[PDB]
Amino acid sequence: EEVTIKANLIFANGSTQTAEFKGTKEKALSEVLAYADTLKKDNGEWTIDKRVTNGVIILNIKFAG
């Protein structure tokens, strides 16, 4: 239930930032997507892909600009 989500925020200008979240799986994922949505105004539409590596959920969030 409790998981660690690592979010790689990949911006179209070439910069990238990372944020980490821990909480119950269902709630945490939904929350990270809602946060990604707040970044759209300044960074464009996002696309996400997911990988579960060594127990950690890795989310690559790419903004189109």
Q: What CATH number is given to the structural domain containing 17?
A: 3.10.20.10
Residue matched to tokens 């946060």: 35
Q: How far apart are CA 4 and CA 25, in angstroms?
A: 8
- For residue 58, how many other CB atoms are within 10 A of its CB? 16
Residue 31, annotated as binding a ligand: no
Range of the domain at 19: 1-65
Report the amino acid identity of residue 47: T
Q: How far apart are CA 17 and CA 27, in angstroms?
A: 22
Domain count of the chain?
1
Residue 2, annotated as binding a ligand: yes
Residue 45, annotated as binding a ligand: no
3-state helix, strand, coil in the chain (%, to 5): 30, 50, 20
